[PDB]
Motif scaffolding. Structure first.
Motif, PDB file in Angstrom:
ATOM      1  N   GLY A 134      10.235   4.592  -0.496  1.00  0.00           N
ATOM      2  CA  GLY A 134       8.829   4.692  -0.871  1.00  0.00           C
ATOM      3  C   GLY A 134       8.015   5.674  -0.051  1.00  0.00           C
ATOM      4  N   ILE A 135       8.632   6.359   0.928  1.00  0.00           N
ATOM      5  CA  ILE A 135       7.891   7.328   1.730  1.00  0.00           C
ATOM      6  C   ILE A 135       7.916   8.672   0.987  1.00  0.00           C
ATOM      7  CG2 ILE A 135       7.540   8.516   3.975  1.00  0.00           C
ATOM      8  CD1 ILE A 135       9.052   6.097   5.302  1.00  0.00           C
TER       9      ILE A 135
ATOM     10  N   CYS B 243      -4.666  14.182   4.164  1.00  0.00           N
ATOM     11  CA  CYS B 243      -6.083  13.802   4.121  1.00  0.00           C
ATOM     12  C   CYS B 243      -6.287  12.383   3.583  1.00  0.00           C
ATOM     13  CB  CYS B 243      -6.917  14.824   3.343  1.00  0.00           C
ATOM     14  SG  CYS B 243      -6.419  15.045   1.621  1.00  0.00           S
ATOM     15  N   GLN B 244      -5.214  11.722   3.074  1.00  0.00           N
ATOM     16  CA  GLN B 244      -5.263  10.332   2.612  1.00  0.00           C
ATOM     17  C   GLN B 244      -4.417   9.440   3.543  1.00  0.00           C
ATOM     18  OE1 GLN B 244      -4.277  10.885  -1.628  1.00  0.00           O
ATOM     19  NE2 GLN B 244      -6.241   9.898  -2.065  1.00  0.00           N
TER      20      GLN B 244
ATOM     21  N   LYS C 135       0.859  -1.191   0.000  1.00  0.00           N
ATOM     22  CA  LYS C 135       0.000   0.000   0.000  1.00  0.00           C
ATOM     23  C   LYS C 135       0.894   1.239   0.000  1.00  0.00           C
ATOM     24  N   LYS C 136       0.772   2.078  -1.043  1.00  0.00           N
ATOM     25  CA  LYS C 136       1.560   3.297  -1.230  1.00  0.00           C
ATOM     26  C   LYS C 136       1.065   4.441  -0.323  1.00  0.00           C
ATOM     27  N   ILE C 137       1.973   5.024   0.488  1.00  0.00           N
ATOM     28  CA  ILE C 137       1.647   6.150   1.358  1.00  0.00           C
ATOM     29  C   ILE C 137       1.400   7.402   0.481  1.00  0.00           C
ATOM     30  CG2 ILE C 137       2.322   7.618   3.345  1.00  0.00           C
ATOM     31  CD1 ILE C 137       4.312   5.216   4.033  1.00  0.00           C
TER      32      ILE C 137
END
Ligand SMILES: Nc1ccn([C@H]2CC[C@@H](COP(=O)(O)OP(=O)(O)OP(=O)(O)O)O2)c(=O)n1
Ligand SMILES: Nc1ccn([C@H]2CC[C@@H](COP(=O)(O)OP(=O)(O)OP(=O)(O)O)O2)c(=O)n1
Ligand SMILES: [Mg+2]
Ligand SMILES: [Mg+2]
Ligand code: NA
Length: 357
Positions: free
Chosen positions: A67-68, A9-10, A2-4
């Motif tokens: 990936g952050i 707000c997401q 799952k991509k941060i």
DNA sequence: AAAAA
DNA sequence: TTTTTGC
DNA sequence: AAAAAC
């Protein structure tokens, strides 16, 4: 897997921060850029701090940052330095900077912001005692209250105090508007144990235009009669039901509001002089805008700004504390709850205690 | 300072 | 590269 | 005035 998301707000951000060593340093660097009016660098450090606050584990190596989003080369250098010896040399240099120290100290006074703090620094002031005793300086009514109740206002408001204030607000408000809905907003609604103030949203489904306008005046006059009103500034509403949206605007919303300092008797707190000065903000909004106002006043500041940024860049929508406008459909979108606002934006609902971005 | 246009 | 970053 | 208040 799952991509941060780059948008607060997401993301779900609770108060359980696993990366405080990194975020305390990033918050200091952001604050220094805010003071130096370097808005871009300020916002980049605020976004990096915000995304790390959302992580369910602590960063312990540079590989963990892969990936952050919102972590560019400058931010990764700061993280690397903290991994190295548990400290940030960059944040340590800011904490020792004279301009930074003066700005933190001067703006800790209610009524003193970035411009007055910068003015006093350039005049050669370094302590609050030297400012207060100066015979040439002239202080605003807000600053006079800020200095008079300084120790109480600088010590933050805890949950038993916020609850005691909530009781006072609710019982004063329903005395004059029995059908009014009073909601504590701000940090305490997001589950915080402390805050610089206590904020409330007040709305009434049946009140007239005049009743709605008079409530803040009636409630503050009642407290003035009891000698509980230490400071009061009521800003009349400039709210217009059909107002044109514009992406260039300054600060505060157009709803009727008041910035107060209340005398909170120790006996009212279920946890000296026998009382504590408390910063209280009350907002009165028309019943049909209650969801937009609640969303805007719940915060956090980073959550609000990313909500608006996402609405603009991802949905071609315009959001503020009063309304939501769809530029493609050329219609205002109505909402009776925060859940309906999130659904209009195509966002999964984020609970208030998950908005601590 | 970071990411999008 | 230049533009945007809530407002 | 700006600046402050969110
Ligand atoms: N630049 C800002 C400042 C405030 N707000 C909104 C969201 C929070 C709300 C109340 O403002 P604060 O009282 O400063 O927020 P807080 O979350 O309640 O934090 P604190 O715990 O320090 O009182 O107004 C905002 O959108 N943008
Ligand atoms: N073009 C102007 C006008 C005024 N000022 C400054 C210098 C004096 C200061 C005065 O603010 P006032 O509102 O005139 O102060 P006050 O009426 O004396 O009372 P209060 O304590 O309520 O602010 O503002 C300024 O910088 N530029
Ligand atoms: Mg608050
Ligand atoms: Mg407030
Ligand atoms: Na201040």
């Amino acid at each position: 897997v799952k991509k941060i998301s780059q948008y607060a707000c997401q993301r779900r951000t609770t108060l359980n921060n696993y990366n405080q060593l990194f975020t305390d340093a990033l918050d200091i660097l952001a604050e220094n850029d805010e003071l130096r009016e370097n808005e871009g660098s300020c916002l980049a450090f605020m976004r990096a701090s915000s995304v790390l606050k959302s992580l369910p584990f602590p960063i312990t190596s540079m590989k963990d940052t892969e990936g952050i989003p919102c972590l560019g080369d400058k931010v990764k250098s700061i993280i690397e330095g903290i991994i190295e010896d548990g400290e940030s040399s960059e944040a340590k240099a800011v904490l020792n900077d004279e301009r930074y120290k003066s700005f933190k100290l001067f703006t800790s006074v209610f009524g003193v912001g970035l411009k007055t703090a910068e003015k006093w620094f350039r005049m050669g002031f370094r302590t609050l005692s030297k400012i207060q005793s100066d015979k040439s300086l002239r202080f605003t009514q807000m600053q006079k209250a800020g200095f008079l109740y300084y120790e109480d206002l600088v010590s933050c408001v805890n949950r038993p105090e916020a609850e005691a204030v909530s009781m006072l607000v609710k019982e004063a408000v329903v005395t004059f508007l029995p059908d009014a809905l009073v909601t504590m907003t701000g940090g305490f609604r997001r589950g915080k144990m402390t805050g610089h103030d206590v904020d409330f949203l007040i709305t009434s489904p049946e009140a007239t235009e005049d009743e709605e306008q008079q409530l803040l005046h009636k409630v503050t006059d009642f407290w003035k009669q009891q000698g509980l009103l230490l400071y009061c500034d009521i800003l009349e509403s400039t709210f217009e039901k059909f107002k044109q949206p514009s992406r260039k605007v300054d600060a505060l919303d157009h709803f009727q509001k008041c910035f107060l300092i209340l005398k909170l008797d120790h006996g009212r707190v279920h946890s000296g002089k026998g009382w504590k000065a408390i910063r209280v903000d009350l907002v009165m909004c028309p019943y049909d805008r209650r969801a937009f106002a609640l969303l805007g006043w719940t915060g956090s500041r980073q959550f609000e700004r990313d909500l608006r940024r996402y609405a603009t860049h991802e949905r071609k929508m315009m959001l503020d504390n009063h309304a939501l406008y769809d530029r493609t459909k050329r219609v205002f979108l109505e909402a009776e709850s925060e859940e309906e606002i999130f659904a209009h934006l195509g966002l999964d609902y984020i609970e208030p205690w998950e908005r601590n971005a």
